[PDB]
Amino acid sequence: PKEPEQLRKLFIGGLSFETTDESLRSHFEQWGTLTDCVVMRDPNTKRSRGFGFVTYATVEEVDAAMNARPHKVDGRVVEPKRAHLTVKKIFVGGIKEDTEEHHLRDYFEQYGKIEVIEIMTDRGSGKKRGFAFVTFDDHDSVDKIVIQKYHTVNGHNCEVRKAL
Ligand SMILES: COCC(=O)NCc1nc2ccccc2[nH]1
């Protein structure tokens, strides 16, 4: 069946106040079927609040829209985000002592462009502590990662969360 609607939404900030439901829709329909598209407005003045949201039919369409950033909508670069604590770094726990950089890179590179991999070691002994941090060049990688129920790396079922 269909992915949960919450995972098919993009919250678009930074809109031009002249963007309408119709112009936001015409823009974002380039990357998929939109089941919903709303510009948020003041209830009395009808003046735009400068943000809105679009709902795609599938998660792959959300991915396509995010991969097509930067989006210039009605002359202004906007800020799309999935369903916000916006960070580029993750904690990866449960990797034990046998997990190496290449295991983490080969897996996580498919979520985004990696800038730093830090495998944590004991300050006194140098032994691996069984966790790591991965820093990406952009927050959408992290957002995709943390909504997955499971992460399997080097045969380990890992705990992954946003870091700082
Ligand atoms: C990114 O996190 C999801 C979320 O709901 N953030 C606040 C939020 N609430 C909204 C209601 C209508 C349109 C846009 C909205 N944005």
Swiss-Prot record:
Modified residues (Phosphoserine): S16
Subcellular location: Nucleus; Cytoplasm
Region (Globular A domain): 1-83
Superkingdom: Eukaryota
Modifications the protein undergoes after translation, according to the UniProt entry: Sumoylated.
Cross-link entry Glycyl lysine isopeptide (Lys-Gly) (interchain with G-Cter in SUMO), positions: K96
Region (Globular B domain) location: 84-164
Crosslinked residue numbers (Glycyl lysine isopeptide (Lys-Gly) (interchain with G-Cter in SUMO2)): K2, K72, K162
Residues covered by the RRM domain: 8-83, 88-164
Record text on subunit structure and interactions: Identified in the spliceosome C complex. Identified in a IGF2BP1-dependent mRNP granule complex containing untranslated mRNAs. Interacts with SEPT6. Interacts with C9orf72. Interacts with KHDRBS1. Interacts with UBQLN2. Interacts with PPIA/CYPA. Interacts (via the RGG-box) with the HOXB-AS3 peptide; the interaction inhibits binding of HNRNPA1 to the intronic sequences flanking exon 9 of the PKM gene, preventing inclusion of exon 9 and promoting inclusion of exon 10 which suppresses formation of the PKM M2 isoform and promotes production of the M1 isoform.
Disease / disorder: Inclusion body myopathy with early-onset Paget disease with or without frontotemporal dementia 3: An autosomal dominant disease characterized by disabling muscle weakness clinically resembling to limb girdle muscular dystrophy, osteolytic bone lesions consistent with Paget disease, and premature frontotemporal dementia. Clinical features show incomplete penetrance.
Function: Involved in the packaging of pre-mRNA into hnRNP particles, transport of poly(A) mRNA from the nucleus to the cytoplasm and modulation of splice site selection. Plays a role in the splicing of pyruvate kinase PKM by binding repressively to sequences flanking PKM exon 9, inhibiting exon 9 inclusion and resulting in exon 10 inclusion and production of the PKM M2 isoform. Binds to the IRES and thereby inhibits the translation of the apoptosis protease activating factor APAF1. May bind to specific miRNA hairpins. (Microbial infection) May play a role in HCV RNA replication.
Protein name: Heterogeneous nuclear ribonucleoprotein A1
Organism: Homo sapiens
Origin organism lineage: Eukaryota, Metazoa, Chordata, Craniata, Vertebrata
Encoding gene per record: HNRNPA1
